[PDB]
PDB file of C-alpha atoms (C1' of nucleotides) in Angstrom:
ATOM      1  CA  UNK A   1      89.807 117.334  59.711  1.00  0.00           C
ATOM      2  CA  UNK A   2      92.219 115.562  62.168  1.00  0.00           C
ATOM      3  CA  UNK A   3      95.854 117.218  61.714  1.00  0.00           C
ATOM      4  CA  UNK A   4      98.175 119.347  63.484  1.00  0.00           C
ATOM      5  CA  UNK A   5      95.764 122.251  65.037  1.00  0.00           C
ATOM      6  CA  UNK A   6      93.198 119.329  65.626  1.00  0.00           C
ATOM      7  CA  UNK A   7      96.163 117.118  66.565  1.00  0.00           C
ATOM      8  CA  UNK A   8      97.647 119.537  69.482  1.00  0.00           C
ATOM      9  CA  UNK A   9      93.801 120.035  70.273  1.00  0.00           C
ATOM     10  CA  UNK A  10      93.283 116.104  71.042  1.00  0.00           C
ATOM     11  CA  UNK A  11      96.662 115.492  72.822  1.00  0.00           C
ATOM     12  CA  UNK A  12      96.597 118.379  75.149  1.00  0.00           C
ATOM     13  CA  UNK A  13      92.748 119.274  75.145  1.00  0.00           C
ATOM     14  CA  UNK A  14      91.632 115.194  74.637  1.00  0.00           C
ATOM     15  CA  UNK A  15      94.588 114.208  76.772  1.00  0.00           C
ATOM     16  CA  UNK A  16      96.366 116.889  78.553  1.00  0.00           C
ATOM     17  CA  UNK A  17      96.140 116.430  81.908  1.00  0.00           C
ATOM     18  CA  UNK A  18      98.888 117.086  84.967  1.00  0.00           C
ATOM     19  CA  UNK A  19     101.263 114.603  85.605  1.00  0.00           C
ATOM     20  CA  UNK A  20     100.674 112.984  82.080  1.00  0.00           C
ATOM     21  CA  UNK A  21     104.099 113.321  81.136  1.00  0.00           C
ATOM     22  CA  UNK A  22     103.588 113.935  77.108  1.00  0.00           C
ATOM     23  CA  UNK A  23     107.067 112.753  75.445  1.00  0.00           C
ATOM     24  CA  UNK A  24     107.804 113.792  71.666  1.00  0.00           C
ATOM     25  CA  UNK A  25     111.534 112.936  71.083  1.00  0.00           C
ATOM     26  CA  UNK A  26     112.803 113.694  67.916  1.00  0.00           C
ATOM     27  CA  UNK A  27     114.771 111.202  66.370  1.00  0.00           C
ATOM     28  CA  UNK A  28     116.655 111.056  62.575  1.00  0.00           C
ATOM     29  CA  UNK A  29     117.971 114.525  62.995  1.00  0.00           C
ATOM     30  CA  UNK A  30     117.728 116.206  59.524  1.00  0.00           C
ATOM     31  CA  UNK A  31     120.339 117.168  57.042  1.00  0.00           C
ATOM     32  CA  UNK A  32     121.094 118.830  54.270  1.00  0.00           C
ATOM     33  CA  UNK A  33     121.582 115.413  51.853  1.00  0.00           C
ATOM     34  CA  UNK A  34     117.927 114.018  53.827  1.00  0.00           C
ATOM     35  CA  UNK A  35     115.845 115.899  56.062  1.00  0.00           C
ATOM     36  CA  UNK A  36     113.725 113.311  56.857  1.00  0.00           C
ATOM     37  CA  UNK A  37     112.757 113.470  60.203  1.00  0.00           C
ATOM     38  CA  UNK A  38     110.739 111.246  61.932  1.00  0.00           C
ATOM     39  CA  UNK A  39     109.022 111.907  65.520  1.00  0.00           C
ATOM     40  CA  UNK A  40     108.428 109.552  68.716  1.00  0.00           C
ATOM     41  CA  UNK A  41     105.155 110.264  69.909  1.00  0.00           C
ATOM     42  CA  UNK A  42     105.580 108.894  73.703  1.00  0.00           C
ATOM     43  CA  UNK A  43     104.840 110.021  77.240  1.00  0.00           C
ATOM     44  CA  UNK A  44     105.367 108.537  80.477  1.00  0.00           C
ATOM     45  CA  UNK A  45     108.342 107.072  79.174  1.00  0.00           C
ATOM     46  CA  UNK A  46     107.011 103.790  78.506  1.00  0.00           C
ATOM     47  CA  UNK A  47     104.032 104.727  76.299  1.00  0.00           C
ATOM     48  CA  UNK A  48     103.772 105.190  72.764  1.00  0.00           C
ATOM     49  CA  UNK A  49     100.971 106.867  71.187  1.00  0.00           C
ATOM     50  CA  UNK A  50     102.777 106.764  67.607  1.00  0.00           C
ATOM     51  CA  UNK A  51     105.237 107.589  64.996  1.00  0.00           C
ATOM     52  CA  UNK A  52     105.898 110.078  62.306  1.00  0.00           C
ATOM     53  CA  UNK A  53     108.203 110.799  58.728  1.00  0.00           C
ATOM     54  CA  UNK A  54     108.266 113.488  56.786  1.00  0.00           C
ATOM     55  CA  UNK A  55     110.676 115.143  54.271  1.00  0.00           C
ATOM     56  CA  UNK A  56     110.332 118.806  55.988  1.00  0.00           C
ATOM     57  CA  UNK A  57     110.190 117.348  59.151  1.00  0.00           C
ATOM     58  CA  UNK A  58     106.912 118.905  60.372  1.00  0.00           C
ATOM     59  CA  UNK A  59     105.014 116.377  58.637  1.00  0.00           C
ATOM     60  CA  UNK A  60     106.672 114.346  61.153  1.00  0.00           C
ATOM     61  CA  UNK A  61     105.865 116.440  64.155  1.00  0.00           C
ATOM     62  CA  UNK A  62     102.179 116.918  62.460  1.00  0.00           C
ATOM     63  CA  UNK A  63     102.227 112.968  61.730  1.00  0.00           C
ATOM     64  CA  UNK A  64     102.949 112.543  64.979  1.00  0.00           C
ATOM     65  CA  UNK A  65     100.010 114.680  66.647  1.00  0.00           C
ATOM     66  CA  UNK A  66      98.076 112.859  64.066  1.00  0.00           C
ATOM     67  CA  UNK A  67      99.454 109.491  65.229  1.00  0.00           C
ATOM     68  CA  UNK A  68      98.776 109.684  68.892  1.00  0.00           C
ATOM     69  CA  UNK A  69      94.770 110.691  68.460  1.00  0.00           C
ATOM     70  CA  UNK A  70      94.693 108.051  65.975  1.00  0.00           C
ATOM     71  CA  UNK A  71      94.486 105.163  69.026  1.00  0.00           C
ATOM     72  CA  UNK A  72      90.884 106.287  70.551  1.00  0.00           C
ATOM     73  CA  UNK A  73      91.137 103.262  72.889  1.00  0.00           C
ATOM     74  CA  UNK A  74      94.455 104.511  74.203  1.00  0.00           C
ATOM     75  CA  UNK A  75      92.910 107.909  73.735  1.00  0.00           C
ATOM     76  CA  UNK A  76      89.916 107.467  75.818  1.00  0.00           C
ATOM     77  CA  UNK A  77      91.333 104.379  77.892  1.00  0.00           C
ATOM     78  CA  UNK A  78      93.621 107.897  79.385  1.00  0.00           C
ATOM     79  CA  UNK A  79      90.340 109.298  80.228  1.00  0.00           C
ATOM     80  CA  UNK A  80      89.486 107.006  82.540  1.00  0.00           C
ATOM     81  CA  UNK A  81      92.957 106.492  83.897  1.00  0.00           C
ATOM     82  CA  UNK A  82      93.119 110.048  84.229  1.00  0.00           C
ATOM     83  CA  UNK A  83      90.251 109.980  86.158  1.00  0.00           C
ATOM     84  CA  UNK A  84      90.964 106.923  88.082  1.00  0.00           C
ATOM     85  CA  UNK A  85      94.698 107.715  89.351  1.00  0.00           C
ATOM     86  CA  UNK A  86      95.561 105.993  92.388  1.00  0.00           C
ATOM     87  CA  UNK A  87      97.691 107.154  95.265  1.00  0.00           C
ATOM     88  CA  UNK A  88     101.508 106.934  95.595  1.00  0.00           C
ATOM     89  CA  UNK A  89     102.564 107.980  91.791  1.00  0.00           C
ATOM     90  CA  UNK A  90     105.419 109.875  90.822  1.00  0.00           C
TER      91      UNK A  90
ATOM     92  C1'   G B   1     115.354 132.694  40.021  1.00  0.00           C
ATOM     93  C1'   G B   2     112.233 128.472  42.848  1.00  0.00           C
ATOM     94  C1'   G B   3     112.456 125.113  47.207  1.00  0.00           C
ATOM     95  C1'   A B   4     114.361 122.398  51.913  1.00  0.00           C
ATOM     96  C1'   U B   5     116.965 121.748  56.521  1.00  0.00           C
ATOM     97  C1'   A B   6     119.796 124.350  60.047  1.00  0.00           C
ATOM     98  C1'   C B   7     122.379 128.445  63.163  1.00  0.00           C
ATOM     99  C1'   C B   8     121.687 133.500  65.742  1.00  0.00           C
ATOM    100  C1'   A B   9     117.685 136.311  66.888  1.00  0.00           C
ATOM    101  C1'   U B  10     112.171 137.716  67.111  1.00  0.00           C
ATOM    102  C1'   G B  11     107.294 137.075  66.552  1.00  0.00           C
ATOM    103  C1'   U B  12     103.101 135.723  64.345  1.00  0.00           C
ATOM    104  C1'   U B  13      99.675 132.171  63.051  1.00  0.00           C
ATOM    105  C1'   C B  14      96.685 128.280  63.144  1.00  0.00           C
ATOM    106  C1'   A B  15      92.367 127.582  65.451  1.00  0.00           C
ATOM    107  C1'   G B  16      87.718 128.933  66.891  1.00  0.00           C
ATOM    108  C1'   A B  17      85.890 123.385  71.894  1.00  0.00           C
ATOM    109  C1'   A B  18      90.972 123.317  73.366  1.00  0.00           C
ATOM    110  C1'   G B  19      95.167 124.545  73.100  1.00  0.00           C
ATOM    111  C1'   A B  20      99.516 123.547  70.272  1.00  0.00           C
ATOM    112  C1'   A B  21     102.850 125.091  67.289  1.00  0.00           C
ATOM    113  C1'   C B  22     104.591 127.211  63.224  1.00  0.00           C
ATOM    114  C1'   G B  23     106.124 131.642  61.113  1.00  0.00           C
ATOM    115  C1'   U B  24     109.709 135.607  60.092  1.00  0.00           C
ATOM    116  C1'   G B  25     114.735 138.259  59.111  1.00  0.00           C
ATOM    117  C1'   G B  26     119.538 137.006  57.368  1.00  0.00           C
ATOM    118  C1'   U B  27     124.144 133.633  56.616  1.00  0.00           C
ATOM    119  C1'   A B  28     125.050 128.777  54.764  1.00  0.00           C
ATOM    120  C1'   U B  29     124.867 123.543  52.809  1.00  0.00           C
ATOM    121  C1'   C B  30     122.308 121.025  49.559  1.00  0.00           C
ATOM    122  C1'   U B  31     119.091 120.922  45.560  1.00  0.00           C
ATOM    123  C1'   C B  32     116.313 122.245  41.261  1.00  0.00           C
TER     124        C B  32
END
RNA sequence: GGGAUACCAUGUUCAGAAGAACGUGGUAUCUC
């Protein structure tokens, strides 16, 4: 299917390259009266590939695998950039 | 007696392209 193990497979095997600069903050920091935890799925630290909920949290972290392979034109538009890649980055 | 998050610690497992990440022992809060 596409979820966590096929998730961490797409961002880092699809789109783990050096210098990418993967970001998954963690936001909504569970508790004992509401778990809930929901994920920023961002890198570069201006790009978003997503968002994720979940009552046990890792649905969150999984959602948030799932929601960055779930834009293929941000997905593969990386592939090119990652190929492309001017000079003078940082 | 079931289940969930977390703290201290430790590792296994998913997978089976690739590699990520979760598990596990116990204390506790909540909750059923």
């Amino acid at each position: 299917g596409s979820l966590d193990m096929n998730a961490k497979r797409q961002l880092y095997s699809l789109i783990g390259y050096a210098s990418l600069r993967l970001h998954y903050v963690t936001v909504k920091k569970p508790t004992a009266v509401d778990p809930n935890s929901i994920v920023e799925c961002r890198v570069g630290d201006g790009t978003v590939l997503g968002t994720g909920v979940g009552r046990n949290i890792k649905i969150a972290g999984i959602r948030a695998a799932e929601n960055a392979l779930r834009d293929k034109k941000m997905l593969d538009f990386y592939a090119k950039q990652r190929a492309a890649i001017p000079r003078s980055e940082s």
